[PDB]
Structure formats: C-alpha cells, structure tokens
Design an enzyme around this catalytic site. Structure first.
Site, PDB file in Angstrom:
ATOM      1  N   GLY A  23      13.725  11.982  50.399  1.00 13.06           N
ATOM      2  CA  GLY A  23      13.042  12.971  49.569  1.00 13.06           C
ATOM      3  C   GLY A  23      11.645  12.542  49.128  1.00 13.06           C
ATOM      4  O   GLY A  23      10.902  13.345  48.560  1.00 13.06           O
TER       5      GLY A  23
ATOM      6  N   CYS B 294       9.135  11.696  51.168  1.00 11.22           N
ATOM      7  CA  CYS B 294       8.114  12.069  52.146  1.00 11.22           C
ATOM      8  C   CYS B 294       7.085  13.013  51.535  1.00 11.22           C
ATOM      9  O   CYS B 294       7.443  13.877  50.738  1.00 11.22           O
ATOM     10  CB  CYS B 294       8.746  12.654  53.406  1.00 11.22           C
TER      11      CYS B 294
ATOM     12  N   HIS C  49       6.784  17.047  59.777  1.00  8.41           N
ATOM     13  CA  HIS C  49       8.218  16.998  60.064  1.00  8.41           C
ATOM     14  C   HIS C  49       9.050  17.855  59.108  1.00  8.41           C
ATOM     15  O   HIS C  49      10.248  17.983  59.335  1.00  8.41           O
ATOM     16  CB  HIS C  49       8.773  15.572  60.185  1.00  8.41           C
TER      17      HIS C  49
HETATM   18  C1  LIG Z   1      21.507   8.004  54.488  1.00  9.69           C
HETATM   19  N1  LIG Z   1      20.137   7.835  54.976  1.00  9.69           N
HETATM   20  C2  LIG Z   1      20.149   7.148  56.271  1.00  9.69           C
HETATM   21  C3  LIG Z   1      19.456   9.126  55.072  1.00  9.69           C
HETATM   22  C4  LIG Z   1      17.947   9.055  54.983  1.00  9.69           C
HETATM   23  O1  LIG Z   1      17.572   7.729  54.568  1.00  9.69           O
HETATM   24  C5  LIG Z   1      16.273   7.503  54.181  1.00  9.69           C
HETATM   25  C6  LIG Z   1      16.085   6.561  53.173  1.00  9.69           C
HETATM   26  C7  LIG Z   1      14.827   6.249  52.748  1.00  9.69           C
HETATM   27  C8  LIG Z   1      13.693   6.870  53.325  1.00  9.69           C
HETATM   28  C9  LIG Z   1      12.364   6.579  52.932  1.00  9.69           C
HETATM   29  N2  LIG Z   1      11.293   7.133  53.474  1.00  9.69           N
HETATM   30  C10 LIG Z   1      11.487   8.021  54.458  1.00  9.69           C
HETATM   31  C11 LIG Z   1      12.725   8.415  54.953  1.00  9.69           C
HETATM   32  N3  LIG Z   1      12.819   9.352  56.038  1.00  9.69           N
HETATM   33  C12 LIG Z   1      13.114  10.779  55.811  1.00  9.69           C
HETATM   34  C13 LIG Z   1      12.842  11.420  57.169  1.00  9.69           C
HETATM   35  C14 LIG Z   1      13.084  10.277  58.179  1.00  9.69           C
HETATM   36  C15 LIG Z   1      14.600  10.095  58.446  1.00  9.69           C
HETATM   37  N4  LIG Z   1      14.794   9.178  59.582  1.00  9.69           N
HETATM   38  S1  LIG Z   1      16.216   8.391  59.676  1.00  9.69           S
HETATM   39  O2  LIG Z   1      17.246   9.381  59.641  1.00  9.69           O
HETATM   40  O3  LIG Z   1      16.141   7.517  60.803  1.00  9.69           O
HETATM   41  C16 LIG Z   1      16.332   7.405  58.197  1.00  9.69           C
HETATM   42  C17 LIG Z   1      15.804   5.969  58.126  1.00  9.69           C
HETATM   43  C18 LIG Z   1      15.418   5.315  59.388  1.00  9.69           C
HETATM   44  N5  LIG Z   1      15.090   4.782  60.341  1.00  9.69           N
HETATM   45  C19 LIG Z   1      15.114   5.442  56.891  1.00  9.69           C
HETATM   46  C20 LIG Z   1      16.529   5.090  57.135  1.00  9.69           C
HETATM   47  C21 LIG Z   1      14.296   9.741  60.842  1.00  9.69           C
HETATM   48  C22 LIG Z   1      12.843  10.128  60.711  1.00  9.69           C
HETATM   49  C23 LIG Z   1      12.058  10.191  61.860  1.00  9.69           C
HETATM   50  C24 LIG Z   1      10.706  10.463  61.785  1.00  9.69           C
HETATM   51  C25 LIG Z   1      10.142  10.700  60.556  1.00  9.69           C
HETATM   52 CL1  LIG Z   1       8.431  10.979  60.452  1.00  9.69          CL
HETATM   53  C26 LIG Z   1      10.891  10.684  59.394  1.00  9.69           C
HETATM   54  C27 LIG Z   1      12.250  10.378  59.462  1.00  9.69           C
HETATM   55  C28 LIG Z   1      12.693   9.043  57.360  1.00  9.69           C
HETATM   56  O4  LIG Z   1      12.369   7.962  57.807  1.00  9.69           O
HETATM   57  C29 LIG Z   1      13.884   7.826  54.364  1.00  9.69           C
HETATM   58  C30 LIG Z   1      15.207   8.135  54.770  1.00  9.69           C
END
Ligand SMILES: CN(C)CCOc1ccc2cncc(N3CC[C@]4(CN(S(=O)(=O)CC5(C#N)CC5)Cc5ccc(Cl)cc54)C3=O)c2c1
Ligand SMILES: CN(C)CCOc1ccc2cncc(N3CC[C@]4(CN(S(=O)(=O)CC5(C#N)CC5)Cc5ccc(Cl)cc54)C3=O)c2c1
Ligand SMILES: [Cl-]
Lengths: 300, 305
Positions: free
Chosen positions: B143, B145, B41
């Site tokens: 950050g 990931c 991703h």
């Molecule tokens: C202000 N915050 C909402 C921003 C990001 O918060 C965060 C906060 C903590 C995180 C911890 N680990 C992993 C994250 N990630 C990073 C990539 C993302 C992001 N999402 S999300 O925007 O839906 C944010 C989330 C939800 N549900 C978690 C709240 C969509 C997504 C779809 C598929 C994949 Cl493989 C990855 C991702 C993800 O989960 C974190 C993300």
C-alpha cells in the site's frame, strides 16, 4: 519490509512555529489558538541565567517588549503570564492552522518526533526518546530553544516536549507544555549534570521482536529466564529494570512472533554476554533502544 | 551539539498526497496543480503484473475507472496519459496547497526524505540515500506505492523519487517523477535482484568530519595518504572510489575542522584495516554513509525552510 527510525509527518506542527524576541534574545514559540508558548528564559540575558528571578524580570515587561513573528506577519501581544518554566503570550490573532491537539507529559522510554527550528522556521525532523535520566539525545544548536517534541497518533497532535537547554555532556533538557521540566533540571546556569544513563530494556526487547518479524532469528536461543534473574544480569550492563508492566506491554509482540517475553529476555542476556560476532540486527551493530513496543507495532 | 539522521519538514509534501484506486488496486498519488502522478502499475491486476502491455491495459480504461480521493473529497479524473512508468491523471481541481516545486533526478550517494503514505494518508517521514546499486533501504509495507522522496532547497520542493516495489532482499526500487527507474529494474513481477552494493566513501568521510565537529577525535592520526593509495585500499573493502570532485566537495569541512581531506582518508584507511576496537563514532559501531557533505554542513549550521 525494512525498519527505519521514523518520525511523524511534521506539517501540523510547522504551521504553529513562530519567532519570539525579547530584547537581544531570540528563540521559537508554539502558536496554538491565541496563545504563543515559549521558554521563560527568553526574558533573560546570559548574566541573568546564573540566578534569575523570573517573577521580578517579568513584572518589568510590557506586552510591546515581546516581538512575535509568524512568517512575515508581526503578531501583537495583548497579555502575558508565566506557568512554571514556560511563558504564555496572549496574542490578538488566533492561529488559523491550529491542529487538533493535547498537551501530554511522557515517561522515560517513550519516543517522540522533534521539529528542530531556528528563528521560527523549521529546519528538520527527527525521532528520539526520553532517556531514563530524563534527558534527550537531540540535535540542537543555539537558537533552537522553543522547538517542540510531539506524537501524532490519528489526527491529534500530542505535544510532549519543549526544548530549553543543553547540558555539559551534549545532551538536552526541556519541559512538558505546562512548563514542568523532565528530570531534576532547572532553567538556571548552575552545576547540573545528566545522571548516569541506562539502556531502555523494554525498547531493546521490542526491537528484537521487530527483527524476528522482519525474518531474523540468529540471536534466539533454547533458554528461558526468570524476571528476577534477567534483572540481576541486565543491571550489570547498565540496563533499566524490566517490570511486570513491561512484560504485559510486550504481550502482543510475543503472541505475534510466538516467542515468550522471558524467552526473548534470555536472547538479550546472551547478546549482552557475547556481542554480535560481526553480525547486525536490522542494519545495526548496537542494541537499539529508541523504538517502543507501540512504535514496532505501528511500523511493522 | 548532537547529530541525528534528520529529514526535511514534510508539510509541503503532505498537502499533495492523495489516494488512487483503479479496480482492486489502491495506492498513493502526488497531486500538483491539476495532475495526479502515480505508478502506472495501478492499472494492473495480480495476473496482469506477470507480463503487462501497459499501453494495451491503459487504452481500455476510462477516466471514471480511476477513483482519486484527496482527504474526504473525491477528485474527478478528466484525462490520463502515461510517461515512462508514471501515470498522469488530469483532474478537474487544481491543488490549492501546491508548493513551489521541481522534478529532479538524483545520483547514487545523494540523500532525500521519504514521506511514507498508505491510502493517501502520510504515516511517517524518514531520511535515506540512493545506494550505489540504485536501491533504497526504505521502510515500506503493502500500500506504500506512490509514496515520494524529496529534498527542500529554500521554499522549493525537489521531488526525486516515487516508490514502486520491493526486491527479495527487503530493499526498495522506484522511479524519478518523470517515470524513469533508478537502476536496472522493471515494473513487472519477474526475477529481479539488487546488485552487490558498495559503501558511499565521500559520505563516510563527511560523517567523520561531523564526529570531529561534535568532539569525537580518537580516530585521527598524524598520517596522510595519496588519493591513488586511498582508492587501492577503498576497492578492497567494497567502498566506492573517491574522486577529485569528492575531495573538492569536502573542502568546507576540511577548512572548518582543520583536517585535510587526505588526512581524514588516512584515518578511514586505518578504521577499514583495523576496525573500531570496541569504540563508537557518533553513537555508532559501523561507518555511516547516509549523510552527504551538504547534510553535515546543513545540520551543523541550522539551515531553515
Ligand atoms: C504478502 N505480500 C507478499 C504481499 C505484498 O508484499 C509487499 C510488501 C511490501 C512492499 C513494499 N513496497 C512495494 C510492494 N509492492 C506492491 C506491488 C509489488 C508486489 N510485488 S510482489 O507481489 O512480488 C511483493 C514483494 C516482492 N518481490 C515485495 C514482496 C510484485 C510487483 C511487481 C512490480 C511492481 Cl512495480 C510492484 C510489485 C511490490 O513490490 C510491497 C509488497
Ligand atoms: C558557545 N556558547 C556560549 C553558546 C551556547 O551554545 C548552545 C548550543 C546549543 C544549545 C542547545 N540547546 C540550548 C542551548 N541553550 C540556550 C540557553 C542556554 C545557554 N546555556 S549554555 O550556553 O551554558 C549551554 C551549553 C552547555 N553546557 C553550551 C551548550 C546555559 C543555559 C542554562 C539553562 C537554560 Cl534553561 C538555558 C541555557 C542553553 O543551554 C544551546 C546553547
Ligand atoms: Cl508515556
């Protein structure tokens, strides 16, 4: 999201661990530059521990009586001296893996990571706190003496603890890296018992702010308290007095969540009175006191 | 004495962490020999995440789009390919700090250490378990990931997890190092939820043996149970079924303490039906399930790496 008891990455410390042997005794040493630091009780037998005269035992030792092993390489001891309860072994090879470091003496309530070692080899890493009674609730078996406690804020390792003893209640005692014990403990097999322990109030408050940051507010109430009334109640539950320093230290977490420190003190008073009623706070059924205000800010 | 949630020493893994930047997304990568492994991703923008065609997004990328940074040194990407939900970036420099390693897929109930990283720099190490619902209760911010989970057996690092995402309940999901997700998850921004979780029974039993080893015996009783009666009670409290394999696996702890596995099961049955009555076990008011039988043996014997 999430809140875990987190330790510092241990790599910088692993590259400093060595094995120190004197006669029949084997324990761990910390190799920084050309000096190996270890508990001075490495020169004792079990009988010597009742009333050891360390100066008399040390004067009879020569450099070749100390066997230092770094991995599969034997280090040569070329000098030795005692500083308080630590022995400093001058070796002929400087540790090429010596990180940027400082020796720091910590206060009760402060946390640190422990790299538990046996025979100079690291086995595990865990986080713990210096209890108000100056002991640590570690996980240490025989042979773990010389294992160290540290923090790594930035690229610098701040060594704060070296393991020396297990007390009768199963808790642990040790020194800073200058050989001064934390607490009234002595590196002698005498009647010593950990004082009555108390809960680290400023840390429980910090962990309640961590829970609010992570989205949990069920424990909050509409009340406030004076600092004196809070301390009168908290002391009845064996909680450490909260000082104006602790209130100042919680300032940033109070501003971030919008909950005044004395308002969070009121929730703590109520949690002590009521318990949790089948609920948890950050996956715990007890009030957690081994996260400092600084640890909460770092992790959240 | 003492019993702590202990992680493996993280040094061998720290020397593999790098920063991977592609476009506006920055995350962590694992550098082993001349390949950097990271979540696929990293090639997605915020909008691309809604419904990504990863082969189509990847075919449009050139090696020079991936910015790989190991400390203060820029690594040059000279090739790339995808394996399941993992991107493999061929770099022109082999990691001189590559440890002896294996990629292993773990089962639910197994534990591992996580080295949480941000911008290719390790910030912390903690221990956790693969839950029966295939999520992990980790501690990860934006950050994180690409941060990895691992076990060490002798001098060999067995990589078992790479972090990809957070679910709405605050729990985490990721893949093995071959890019196969643990659990029914996808690397897209769609409605996904953690399933109903259960307690890891064999682990609670192991932790009760750890308490006995550490001098806590108040929960022991004269009674025993059958495996069938124990499982009927276990299914009632959302506990995983205990199998004959679990009973065999607890054998060494059953011999060290002198308490038969079905005798410890009768103690757990009474704790489930009546609670702790204001008492704690190893400083906990809950029944702990994130220590495997092997973790208890290793911590109560001093196994080194
Ligand atoms: C202000 N915050 C909402 C921003 C990001 O918060 C965060 C906060 C903590 C995180 C911890 N680990 C992993 C994250 N990630 C990073 C990539 C993302 C992001 N999402 S999300 O925007 O839906 C944010 C989330 C939800 N549900 C978690 C709240 C969509 C997504 C779809 C598929 C994949 Cl493989 C990855 C991702 C993800 O989960 C974190 C993300
Ligand atoms: C079964 N026992 C005979 C073996 C001891 O087991 C152990 C088990 C775990 C240990 C963890 N850390 C540190 C140990 N050490 C090593 C040096 C020693 C020894 N002792 S003791 O055995 O009385 C300690 C004990 C109690 N109470 C039995 C836990 C006296 C002593 C006095 C002062 C100093 Cl500086 C050092 C020591 C010590 O504590 C461990 C020792
Ligand atoms: Cl301090």
């Amino acid at each position: 999201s999430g809140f875990r008891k987190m330790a510092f990455p241990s790599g910088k410390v692993e590259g400093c661990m060595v094995q120190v042997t004197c006669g029949t005794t084997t324990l761990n040493g910390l190799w920084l530059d050309d000096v190996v630091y270890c508990p001075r009780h490495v020169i004792c037998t079990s009988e010597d521990m009742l009333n050891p005269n360390y100066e008399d035992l040390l004067i009879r030792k020569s450099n070749h009586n100390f066997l230092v092993q770094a991995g599969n390489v034997q280090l040569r001891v070329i000098g030795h001296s005692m500083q308080n309860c630590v022995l400093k072994l001058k070796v002929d090879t400087a540790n090429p893996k010596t990180p940027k470091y400082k020796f720091v003496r910590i206060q009760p309530g402060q946390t640190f990571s422990v790299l538990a070692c046996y025979n100079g080899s690291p086995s595990g890493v865990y986080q713990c706190a210096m209890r108000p009674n100056f002991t640590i609730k570690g996980s240490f078996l025989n042979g773990s003496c010389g294992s160290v406690g540290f923090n790594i804020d930035y690229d610098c390792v701040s060594f704060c603890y070296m393991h020396h003893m297990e007390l009768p209640t199963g808790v642990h005692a040790g020194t800073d890296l200058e050989g001064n014990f934390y607490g009234p403990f002595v590196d002698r097999q005498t009647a010593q018992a950990a004082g009555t322990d108390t809960t680290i109030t400023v840390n429980v408050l910090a962990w309640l702010y961590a829970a609010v940051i992570n989205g949990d507010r069920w424990f909050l109430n509409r009340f406030t308290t004076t600092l004196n009334d809070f301390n009168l109640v908290a002391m009845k539950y064996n909680y450490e007095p909260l000082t104006q320093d602790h209130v100042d230290i919680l300032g940033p977490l109070s501003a971030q969540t919008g909950i005044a420190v004395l308002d969070m003190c009121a929730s703590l008073k109520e949690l002590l009175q009521n318990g949790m009623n089948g609920r948890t706070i950050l996956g715990s059924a007890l009030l957690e006191d081994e996260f400092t205000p600084f640890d909460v800010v770092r992790q959240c």
